[PDB]
Symmetry: D2
Subunit: 117 residues, 4 copies
């Protein structure tokens, strides 16, 4: 049940489609940051996970360039899909910015987002 | 600039193609871990970077299931490309595994990879 | 308002004293992992934070060895303290284990802990 | 053999002292960022590590406030010590700034440092 619309604790919107070959496709809208409207994403996931009750591993990427603006940055979300009464996706993310060699030490932010429907 | 074959410090081979629309397609082979042979990747990149000399931000994802085996895991690489005499892709990554909720605290590994020609 | 007893979402107990010298001293009890009983901690914090409302930056370290056990690992917590009606300490952590360099790529877990009163 | 002067790939200086009880004490100077001169550090380490050839786990913290300035920030380094002809300390670090509740998503940087003599 990964396919569908999800929201994280910041109020961002994540619209996902789960391919039977393990593909991920959709749209992302950030409530925060140097962004506006939708941005394209793509990723992959385990299409044959364990049935001992483990969650489903997954990942996806967004580059913050669209028709309206460029932050010159990209984010990847890595985490696992969890089912049951209340399904959620728990992730941790990295946000890298394009920088000069001078400032590369401070190019990457880390954090975590939690998504539900 | 990005399209082509790259190798990281572990012996792993990353074979990429960067579409002009910001898309990333290719193959990945890991020198290490619960893997063998090639795996499909996909990702995104800033197809309109700065002219001030900044690097080119990008990211990509790999789910470790192919026709030979399934580790039930996925990695995302977030970083930026740097060109010139010595071209490199400098990244940090997240490797998340499918876990029970009891062990979810130990579900995600962190690291860094450097890619060169 | 840092000194005192805190608990995180795992049910771990974090007992801290904030000295005026920017120092952090205390004990830690983990509800999870290769652990039993208390372990020593020590850290640092901004003893002169902004008055604009920003949080209080801080961090602390724990090596998992005590009279009862040795897990051959260490965790660092980095975050900020936030006061008011409901005070919290928001962190991200790095848990590193001793390994052979062949397995060095799988040496480091990343996570986040939330601490309340 | 953790005690001694080390430098990272940025040319920052790490002056460390390992107490017999698993304590770490010393000074830190950053070649970069919002800082100048020496800053106090404290941390812990595994004082009875495995003999199978694994590295020694360790960690330490620095709050970026001293007699000359205050960044309102702290960094924690988590990693392990590795001995031999090329003795090194391999780390990943987290750098957190004090922020408002609104800007917390951009409060924490991650990277990696390599220390040698
Ligand atoms: O500021 C940028 O460079 C682009 C916007 C970044 C928004 C980030 S991605 C991680 C986090 N989760 C969200 O929903 N928004 C922020
Ligand atoms: O072990 C697994 O479950 C999957 C194999 C992952 C190996 C990792 S991905 C990050 C790092 N870079 C590599 O080239 N290999 C490792
Ligand atoms: O090496 C071990 O197995 C013990 C690690 C302790 C469990 C971790 S430390 C980070 C996180 N926060 C907690 O309260 N527990 C886990
Ligand atoms: O917050 C600041 O502006 C001062 C901190 C300086 C950044 C650091 S800590 C990680 C990295 N390693 C190092 O030696 N210097 C930078």
């Amino acid at each position: 049940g990964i396919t569908g619309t999800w929201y994280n604790q910041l109020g961002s919107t994540f619209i996902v489609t789960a391919g039977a070959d393990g593909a991920l496709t959709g749209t992302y809208e950030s409530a925060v940051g140097n962004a506006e409207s939708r941005y394209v994403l793509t990723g992959r996931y385990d299409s044959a996970p364990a049935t001992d009750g483990s969650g489903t591993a997954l990942g996806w990427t967004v580059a913050w360039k669209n028709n309206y603006r460029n932050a010159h940055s990209a984010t990847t979300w890595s985490g696992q899909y969890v089912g049951g009464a209340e399904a959620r996706i728990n992730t941790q993310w990295l946000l890298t910015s394009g920088t000069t060699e001078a400032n590369a030490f401070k190019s990457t932010l880390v954090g975590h987002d939690t998504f539900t429907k």
